[PDB]
Amino acid sequence: EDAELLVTVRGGRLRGIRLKTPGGPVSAFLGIPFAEPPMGPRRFLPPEPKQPWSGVVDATTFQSVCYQYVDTLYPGFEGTEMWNPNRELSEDCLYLNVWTPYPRPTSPTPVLVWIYGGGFYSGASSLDVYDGRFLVQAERTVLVSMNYRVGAFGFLALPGSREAPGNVGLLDQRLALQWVQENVAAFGGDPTSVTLFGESAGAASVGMHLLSPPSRGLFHRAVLQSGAPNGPWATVGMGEARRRATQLAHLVGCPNDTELVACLRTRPAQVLVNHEWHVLPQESVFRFSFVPVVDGDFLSDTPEALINAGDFHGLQVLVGVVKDEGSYFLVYGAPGFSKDNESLISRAEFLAGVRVGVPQVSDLAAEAVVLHYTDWLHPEDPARLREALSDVVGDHNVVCPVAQLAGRLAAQGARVYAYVFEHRASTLSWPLWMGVPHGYEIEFIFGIPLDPSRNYTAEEKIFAQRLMRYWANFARTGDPNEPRDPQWPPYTAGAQQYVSLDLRPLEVRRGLRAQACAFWNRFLPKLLSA
Amino acid sequence: EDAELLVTVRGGRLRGIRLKTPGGPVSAFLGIPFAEPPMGPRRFLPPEPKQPWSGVVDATTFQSVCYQYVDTLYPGFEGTEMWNPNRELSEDCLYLNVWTPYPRPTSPTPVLVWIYGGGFYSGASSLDVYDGRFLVQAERTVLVSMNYRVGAFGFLALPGSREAPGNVGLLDQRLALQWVQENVAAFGGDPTSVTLFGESAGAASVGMHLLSPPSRGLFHRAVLQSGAPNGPWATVGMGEARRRATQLAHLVGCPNDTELVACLRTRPAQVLVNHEWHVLPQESVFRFSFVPVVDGDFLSDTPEALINAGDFHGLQVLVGVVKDEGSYFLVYGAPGFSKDNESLISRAEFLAGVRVGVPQVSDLAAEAVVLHYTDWLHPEDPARLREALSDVVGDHNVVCPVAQLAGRLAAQGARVYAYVFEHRASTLSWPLWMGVPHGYEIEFIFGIPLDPSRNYTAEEKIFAQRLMRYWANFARTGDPNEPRDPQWPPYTAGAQQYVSLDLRPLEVRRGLRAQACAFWNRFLPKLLSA
Numbered sequence A, B: 001e002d003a004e005l006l007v008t009v010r011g012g013r014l015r016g017i018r019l020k021t022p023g024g025p026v027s028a029f030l031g032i033p034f035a036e037p038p039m040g041p042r043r044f045l046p047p048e049p050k051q052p053w054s055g056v057v058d059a060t061t062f063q064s065v066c067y068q069y070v071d072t073l074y075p076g077f078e079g080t081e082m083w084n085p086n087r088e089l090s091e092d093c094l095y096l097n098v099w100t101p102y103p104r105p106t107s108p109t110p111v112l113v114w115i116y117g118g119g120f121y122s123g124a125s126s127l128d129v130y131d132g133r134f135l136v137q138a139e140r141t142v143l144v145s146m147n148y149r150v151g152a153f154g155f156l157a158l159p160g161s162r163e164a165p166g167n168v169g170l171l172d173q174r175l176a177l178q179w180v181q182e183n184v185a186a187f188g189g190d191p192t193s194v195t196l197f198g199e200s201a202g203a204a205s206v207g208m209h210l211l212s213p214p215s216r217g218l219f220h221r222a223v224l225q226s227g228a229p230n231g232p233w234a235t236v237g238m239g240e241a242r243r244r245a246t247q248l249a250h251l252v253g254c255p256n257d258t259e260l261v262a263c264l265r266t267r268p269a270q271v272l273v274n275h276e277w278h279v280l281p282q283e284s285v286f287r288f289s290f291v292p293v294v295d296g297d298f299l300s301d302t303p304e305a306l307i308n309a310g311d312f313h314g315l316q317v318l319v320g321v322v323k324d325e326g327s328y329f330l331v332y333g334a335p336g337f338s339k340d341n342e343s344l345i346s347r348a349e350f351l352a353g354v355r356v357g358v359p360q361v362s363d364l365a366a367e368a369v370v371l372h373y374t375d376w377l378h379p380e381d382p383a384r385l386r387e388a389l390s391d392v393v394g395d396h397n398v399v400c401p402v403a404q405l406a407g408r409l410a411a412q413g414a415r416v417y418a419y420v421f422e423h424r425a426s427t428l429s430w431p432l433w434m435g436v437p438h439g440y441e442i443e444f445i446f447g448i449p450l451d452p453s454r455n456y457t458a459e460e461k462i463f464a465q466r467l468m469r470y471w472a473n474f475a476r477t478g479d480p481n482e483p484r485d486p487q488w489p490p491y492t493a494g495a496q497q498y499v500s501l502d503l504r505p506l507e508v509r510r511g512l513r514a515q516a517c518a519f520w521n522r523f524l525p526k527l528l529s530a
C-alpha cells in the first residue's frame, strides 16, 4: 500500500489514487463525501454534514453527477457533448475532489477551489475540461472542486417555508468550503490562503460568496470568469421564485407549502427535470428556471446593492471575459441562427432576436437596445446584424455585469485585475462566426492542452502554461505578475486597464466595452424605473 | 435720367439706383413698399396690400428695420455687430428689395428670393452680409429680399382671437411672394421660376411655406441653410403661445383677449422688445419667445406631421449645415463658456449645459443625452466636453431636424441635394474653438469675398464663385451640378450622400451624423411619449 494515498480527515480515513501527468505524478482524492445524501425527505433542504465513518472510504473516481437536464441540441456534436454529464445522474451527488502534488507537500501550500458553471441548472466536477492534474503538477497548488445541487433540486424556492427555503445549492458550496477549512491541511494545503475561482454560473457563485458574510470568512481571493452575481440571469426575486416553483408543482400534478413540497418529493427526479424549461415567463436565451433567490439570508439585498455598498479593502480579485460572450446563446432560440450555416440574419430577425435576448423589458427599453446596436449607415447588413445581436446578448448578460463589478470593487478597496481572453482554440468545433465563445478559456486555465491525447498546437501548450502561471501567481500572492521579471496593471475605475490573453505577449488595453456598458449599467436601469 | 432705373409696378412708379461691383454694374430697387404700415390698430394684424401711390417712390436706399432686440453681448465686437440693425428701427418696415442685372434683362430671368434668419425675433434685409449685387452680376438672376415682422410684432399669438391671430410675420413673407408673382416681370424676372432660399429661421420659414398650400403656388424650388420647420425652436403650440403672450402683457402693465391686445397696442414698440426674453419658460440657448404657432391655419398640423404625410414629387430642395452648428449658441448662457478663453468646461458645467441646451425635457431624457454624448473612456476631459456640448446643441436644433426633413422629402418624391459647409472664413473674428459657426456660410453664398475692401484670400474668392454657381445652377434647373462638365449626388434615405463644401473639390460622404440623429429623431420622441 502507498502511504501517500492515505489521508485521514475529520470524518475518517480516505484512500486516493496516483494520477499520471506528462510532467509527473499527482495524488488525487476523487469523490470524498461532504454531505449526507440529499434524498427523500432531504430533497430541497439545506445540506447536512457527512456523519463520520469507520474503515476507509475509497476516493478513487468521480462520483455521480447531480440530476440535471441533458443538452440535446446537437446530439453527438463535440461542442455540446463536452458539457454533458459523464457519470450517472443521481440525487446522491454531494462529493468533492482534492488534487495535491506527489508526494504530498510538507510546507502549507496555497489552495484553489473550483466552482463549475452551467446556468445553475447543469454542470459537474467530473467533466474532462475541469481535470485538475495539470494545474497541480505545473504550479504545485492544492486544487479542490465540489459538486453542488442544480436545477429544482438546488434552487427551487418557496421563500419563507421550512421545506424549500431556496439557495441550497449555494449552501452545498458553502459546506464544501467549510470542509476545506477544517481538512485541507491534511492534504498539505494551507487554509489561510484559499482562492475561489469559477466560470459563468460558477463565477456568479464566487461573487455571491463575496457578498455573503458567512462565506466571506472561508476564502481570501477570488477569480470570476465570464460571470458575476449581478448578472440579470443569476438571481431572481422571491415572488418570481414562488411563481416558477408553483408552476412546476402544478405541471407535475402537485397541489400550504408543506404539502406542496411533500408532494414534490414523491416525484421522480426526471419528472421535475422534464418540466424545468416550461416555467420560464418569456421566450428567451441565457435565462434559467431555478437560480439563487434574494430572500434576505444568503443575500441580504440584491447583488447590485451589496456591491455598491461594500467595503472590499483587503480583497484581491481577477475578472475577465472571452472575446465573443453571446454567440453560443443565439443557436438556443434566436431566429435565423444555426451552427451549420453562417446565421446571416435579416433585420426583422434581428429585431425579433433582441426581444429573445433581452427578455422581460419594456418595448421602450427594447427600442433603446435597437438604437444603440444598429449601425444606421448599414441597418440591413446581415453580417453586422449578426455580430450586433451577439454583442447585445454578451454585453447584457456577461460583459457589462462584470465591468460594473470590477469598477465598484476597485473604487471600494479591492485590488482588481482584468482580462479579455482572445484566443480561439485550434480544436474548437463551433463555427468560425462564433469567434471565441462562452466557456472556451477553461481548457487553457486547467492545462488540458498538455494532455498528449489531445491535438493542440505547441503554441497553445505554451499559452496554457502561461495562463496557469498567472492564475497560480494570483492564488499565491494576489497578483498575477511574475514576482521577479510585460506587466499586467491593476484595473481601476478611472484608467479601466485590462490585458488581452492570446498567443502574443500581454497587451494593455483600456475600457471593457465602456460605451456599451454605460447604457446597460447607467441608462437602462433609470428607464426601467420610469 | 436713366430709363433703366425707372420702373412701374402695379402700385405706381419707382426710381432705382445703379450699383458697382468688381464685375460691372447692377440695378437696385431698395425699399419698395409692399404692405400698408402695420402700425397703431394694425399692430399684430395680418399685412394688407400697399394701396397705390402717385408720384415716384424713391427706391435708392434700404428702409427701416422692423423693431427687434439688439444684441449687446460683446459690444462693438464685429462677430455680433454684423447681425445688428444697420438702419433705424420702425414698425413701418414692410419693404422689399430687387437687384437685377444692368441693363435690366429684357427676357425672363430666374428669381431668387431671400428670407433672413434671426430666430423670428431679429433680422433685416439691409445687412451687409445679404448684399445681392455679386450674385446678380455673376449669375445673372433677379434677387429679391423682404423685411418681415419679428418678435411680438410678427408672432405674438392669442390663438383663436381676431386681434392677435399669430403668424403675421409669415403672412408678410407670403405677401412679398405674391408681390413677386405680380410685379417681378417689370424688372425682367420670370415669375414661373422662383427659388426661395433662407438661413436659420429663414430656412425654417422656407420650410413652412413648403407645408402651407396657399404659399406653395408662389415658388418652385427651395434652399434651406442650417434650419428646418421641424426644429424644436421653430414652432410653439397654442397653449404655450397664449401663455407667453399673456405673461408679456403682465410684464408691461396690461390686464379678455380683446382687452389684452388693446393695451399692448398702446405700448411703445421698444417696451415690448424690452421684456421679450423674460417670457421664455426655462434657462435656455437657441430658444426664442415669439415664433410660428401651430393653429390649424398657416400650419394645419405640426411640421413634423405635415412632413411625414406629404407628396413631394415635383420638388427640388437644396439643404445643408455648417460644420459646427452649436458653438455660437453656447456663449449666450451655457456655464463656463466665453469667446475670450478656451471654454474648457468641467463635467459639472457640461451636465448643467445639457439642461440649458436641451430645455424642457424630462430628467430621464437629459440622462439619455448625457449617455450618448459622454466619452466614457474620458468622461472628464474638458476639450471633449466642450465639443460634446456643442454637438448636443447643434444636433438637437439644426443637424438632426435638417436630416429628418431631407430623408422624408427624399423618400416621398423630392429630389434633395445636401451639403456640409466646412470652410472657416479667414476673416472670422470668433475664436478658433468654435470652428465654422452658425451663419458663416452666408457671406460666401452672396459672394462677399469678391468685394475688394474686405480682406479675403484669392482662393476664398474662387470658393465664393463656385458656391454662387452651385446655388444659381440649382435656381435655374433644380440641379447644382454644372450641366456640361466632380458630381454632387442627390441625397436619399438609403445612401444618405452629401458633399463637403470647402476649398478642396467636392468630396462625397454618407450620412448627416446618422448615429446621433437616430437618437434625436427616433428614440427621444418615444421616450417623451412615455
Ligand SMILES: *[C@@H]1O[C@H](CO[C@@H]2O[C@@H](C)[C@@H](O)[C@@H](O)[C@@H]2O)[C@@H](O[C@@H]2O[C@H](CO)[C@@H](O)[C@H](O)[C@H]2NC(C)=O)[C@H](O)[C@H]1NC(C)=O
Binding pocket: A333, A334, A335, A336, A337, A338, A340, A341, A342, A343, A344
Ligand atoms: C440557418 O439555419 C437556420 C436554422 O435552420 C435549421 O438548420 C438549417 C441548417 C437547416 O437544416 C434547416 O432546415 C433547419 O431548420 C435557418 O432558420 C430556419 O429557417 C427555416 C426555413 O428553411 C425555418 O423553418 C426555421 O424556423 C428557421 N429556424 C430558426 C431558428 O430561425 C436560417 O434560415 C439559416 N440561414 C441561412 C440559410 O442563411
Ligand SMILES: *[C@@H]1O[C@H](CO[C@@H]2O[C@@H](C)[C@@H](O)[C@@H](O)[C@@H]2O)[C@@H](O[C@@H]2O[C@H](CO)[C@@H](O)[C@H](O)[C@H]2NC(C)=O)[C@H](O)[C@H]1NC(C)=O
Binding pocket: B333, B334, B335, B336, B337, B338, B340, B341, B342, B343, B344
Ligand atoms: C472662460 O470665461 C467664462 C466667462 O467668464 C467671463 O469671461 C472671462 C473672460 C472673464 O472675464 C470672467 O471674469 C467673466 O466673468 C468663465 O466662467 C465664469 O467664471 C467666473 C469665475 O471667475 C464665474 O463667476 C462666472 O459665473 C462664469 N461664467 C459662466 C458663464 O460660466 C470660465 O471659467 C472661463 N474658462 C476658463 C478660464 O477656463
Ligand SMILES: COc1cc2c(cc1OC)C(=O)[C@@H](CC1(F)CCN(Cc3ccc(F)cc3)CC1)C2
Binding pocket: A071, A083, A116, A117, A118, A119, A123, A199, A200, A201, A277, A283, A284, A285, A286, A287, A328, A329, A332, A333, A438, A439
Ligand atoms: C432546453 O432549452 C434551452 C436550453 C438552453 C437555453 C435556452 C433554452 O430554452 C430557451 C440556453 O440559453 C442555453 C445556455 C447554454 F449556456 C449555452 C452554452 N452552454 C455551454 C456551457 C458553457 C459554459 C459552462 F460553464 C457550461 C456550459 C450550454 C448551455 C441552454
Ligand SMILES: COc1cc2c(cc1OC)C(=O)[C@@H](CC1(F)CCN(Cc3ccc(F)cc3)CC1)C2
Binding pocket: B083, B116, B117, B118, B119, B199, B200, B201, B277, B283, B284, B285, B286, B287, B328, B329, B332, B333, B438, B439
Ligand atoms: C438676450 O438673451 C438671449 C439672447 C440670445 C440667446 C439667448 C438669450 O437668452 C437666453 C440665443 O440663443 C442667441 C442666439 C443667436 F442666434 C446666436 C447667433 N447669432 C448670430 C446670427 C446667426 C445667424 C443669423 F441668421 C443671425 C444672427 C444671433 C443670436 C441670442
